[PDB]
Copies of this chain bind each other. A is one copy, B any other.
Amino acid sequence: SDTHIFIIMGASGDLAKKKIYPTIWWLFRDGLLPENTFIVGYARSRLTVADIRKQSEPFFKATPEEKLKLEDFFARNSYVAGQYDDAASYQRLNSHMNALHLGSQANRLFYLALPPTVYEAVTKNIHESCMSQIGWNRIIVEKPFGRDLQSSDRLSNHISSLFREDQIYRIDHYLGKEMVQNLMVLRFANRIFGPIWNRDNIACVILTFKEPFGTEGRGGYFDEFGIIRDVMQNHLLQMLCLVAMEKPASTNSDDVRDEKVKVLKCISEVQANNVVLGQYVGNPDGEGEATKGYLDDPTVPRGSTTATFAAVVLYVENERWDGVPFILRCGKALNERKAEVRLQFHDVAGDIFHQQCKRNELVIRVQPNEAVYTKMMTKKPGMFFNPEESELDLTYGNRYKNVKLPDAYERLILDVFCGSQMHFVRSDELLEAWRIFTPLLHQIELEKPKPIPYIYGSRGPTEADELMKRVGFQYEGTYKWVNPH
């Protein structure tokens, strides 16, 4: 029943236009926001709410029946022009917020839809000029959080000198995805997954992020950070933590994040011996973008060695996981779009089926086509006695046909309104993540190894499969699945 103000810093930018304004509209439309909520845009351009509406409403997918809700939404919107390090401008923004209904008392949520080069100036000026003295104040920050241990150190130190940890909401948007959030319930609400979730039963864990398209003419931005910073140090490592963590003392946000940091503290720095890097080249037999390699993007520097693919093996050196390889595999221009967690279990001990069994697997497919299934052995159906691979399956598209699955940003923004930090990256989480990868990132920067070429649309360099086999992953190619429609 308190007033809430949602401040979109960088309201003129593309992320605000296509993602943040549509998301806050969808939450508003669905009745999920506090009744007394206002939206304030802030950016350099001299805009009006009319301009904000013209630019973003095409992405709202509004229906004719939503006309009244839409009018109320934009009546609750306003816009303040100003520079990002100009004190007087933030004084104008603060006075503007105070003048809203109960604006002095309101809770204030600042979304930094801005490039990281202005994070320090924006957070400094918000702290100096725009904090509520009565309501809470929360800041939402998106990546990049630095480029390595040192650069993340400095950003984190600046922000923490101003804001308490319970005011900082760092987005990793995979933490907003349906099946990523499900990892904790699958693991800790089920006896069928409890006593087997350990090194005595698990031979290897595979965390996968694949996209079938290349850089799409935007490689110049990607070239400055590469695939490990892009997808592995954040999304894949987050999935690792949720797969590996001990059971938390409760589902309180910091009991959960405590257990995630504890996992990271038992991972040593990755070394090049456990790393395979690739860069995609064009497929002469392909069509369209598939004929073009990474270096065929004219925004990519000539002779770039930036990796578009990486397979990395990590180890969690604790009692539950000692010696179990965690394989993190990701890349662009591969054969499919897929984000997935896979457990491969050890062979059954004391084989009585004359070497016909294959290792069980548990698969949590995050996207597309959200699903959980366990590959297991069944008696070959019919007049046969030999075991054959089959699966127990849960596919959301068929089990939950009419259930809307919210976008990650819908879920995460709502969490900030509700004060739940469970699905946001804590300061110490971030530090450990950079600790694990910075020696490798510095060696790549220093020595500039040439990545292994792989053809657009392939599974990546075969050396990645060899690395996975070396550490204990077994692939047979015997499993046959066809959709029961």
Contacts and interface: CB of A to CB of B under 8 A. Distances in A.
Interface in A297-332: none
A50 interface: no
Q: Which of A352, A360, A362, A372 has the most chain B CB atoms inside 10 A of its CB?
A: A352
A392 interface: yes
B414 A189 contact: no
A379 B191 contact: no
A212 to B, nearest CB: 26
Interface in A391-415: 391-396, 398-401, 403-406, 410-411, 414
A182 to B, nearest CB: 4
B414 A383 contact: yes
Nearest to A188: B352
Given A353-B251, A374-B192, A381 B410 contact: no
Contacts of A190: 348, 360, 376-377
Contacts of A184: 379
A477 interface: no
A484 B399 contact: yes
Interface string A350-375: 10110001011010000000001110
Contacts of A335: none
Contact of A484 (B348, B377, B398, B404): B398
Given A247-B352, A348-B188, A381 B396 contact: yes
Nearest to A189: B377
Interface in A22-55: 32
Nearest to A203: B191
B392 A178 contact: no
A262 interface: no
A400 B32 CA distance: 44
Contact of A360 (B191, B346, B394): B191
A185 B395 contact: no
A65 to B, nearest CB: 21
A345 interface: yes
Interface stretch (A163-171, A194-202, A232-240, A464-472): A194-202
Contacts of A485: 398, 485
Interface in A116-138: none
A350 B251 CA distance: 12
Contacts of A185: 353, 377-379, 387
A72 B411 CA distance: 71
A146 interface: no
Contacts of A182: 378-379
A100 to B, nearest CB: 27
Contact of A392 (B359, B373, B396): B373
A249 B190 CA distance: 31
Given A32-B383, A373-B392, A383-B406, 11 more contacts: A178-B382, A182-B378, A186-B378, A189-B353, A191-B347, A192-B362, A250-B352, A374-B392, A378-B394, A382-B403, A383-B414
